Design a protein around this ligand. Structure first.
Ligand code: HEC
Ligand code: HEC
Ligand SMILES: [Zn+2]
Lengths: 136, 137
């Protein structure tokens, strides 16, 4: 029913990164530099298999500071989490969605059972609701 | 110096940090783009405040980016820079060997001077064993 905090996510495989700057549609509240991490089970789905139960993707979001035309990572704003479990999270397409303010376990952000996150991710139905693609 | 080994499988290693260097910045040429730093297990012992065992490898992975409606999106890989720790083998440049691979390709080795040019800049970080990156949370 609740998404588990993903302890140890920082040592998982770095899928990709992206910078969202002011003015982008997703600025609020996804503005900043973000990195996507996948555990072993999520890698299987990214590589083209089905996502097994227990797959986890993390969206790791940092503020940045612009300093002499370099963007430098500042403080972590939040993490977004998707946890695969076809049965428990069937209401939201088999993924449970949670946000943790500042990446801390006790700061849960989602208040609508994940429906809001799910409504945008539904656009990626064809890729099992995941936007990120593996690059080399 | 012997050759620095191409770091096979580095994409699976621990992601240390990232930074974006944009036009105007002093390092735009040649380090412009979005870069990511990776470290293998031995390098982590060194980054943690331990000492660096021989066999520690750090990788700087550099991508061009594109601007897309107030997002910077990663484009093509321009190169990877590699530091491979071997105190005796690479003593001429501080115990680390330095190599670049154009577009990340094993056959596109870039360094022609034994790593002296790369070392000239990293020597500023003598105090941290020639490594600029710091571990974060
Ligand atoms: C559209 C309006 C979105 C909403 C609302 C949410 N997310 Fe999403 N998310 C979106 C995009 C475009 C992306 C891809 C970013 C990229 O670098 O390409 C993401 C990514 C994630 C991920 C990473 C896995 C993936 O699908 O690519 C996670 C773990 C994730 N998002 C979680 C998440 C949660 C918990 C949300 C509600 C609190 C949520 N997202 C909303 C677009 C949108
Ligand atoms: C100054 C003019 C530099 C020269 C020349 C080279 N590098 Fe360097 N390097 C420099 C900086 C400021 C940084 C830090 C980037 C960051 O995000 O903080 C780096 C980093 C690396 C790394 C990563 C490990 C570390 O020291 O932080 C590697 C593996 C690396 N650089 C390799 C490398 C090689 C192979 C070079 C010559 C081909 C080289 N660097 C030159 C600054 C400068
Ligand atoms: Zn605009």
């Amino acid at each position: 029913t609740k998404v588990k905090y993903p302890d140890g996510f920082r040592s998982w495989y770095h899928v990709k990164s992206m910078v969202i700057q002011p003015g982008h549609p997703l600025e609020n509240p996804f503005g900043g530099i973000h990195h996507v991490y996948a555990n072993a089970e999520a890698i299987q789905g990214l590589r083209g298999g089905n996502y097994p139960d227990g797959a986890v993707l993390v969206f790791d979001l940092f503020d940045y500071q612009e300093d002499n035309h370099a963007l430098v990572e500042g403080k972590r704003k939040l993490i977004g989490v998707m946890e695969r479990d076809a049965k428990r999270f069937s209401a939201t397409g088999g993924w449970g969605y949670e946000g943790f303010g500042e990446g801390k376990p006790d700061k849960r952000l989602v208040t609508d059972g994940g429906q809001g996150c799910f409504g945008c991710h539904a656009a990626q139905k064809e890729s099992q609701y995941v936007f990120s693609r593996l690059r080399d």
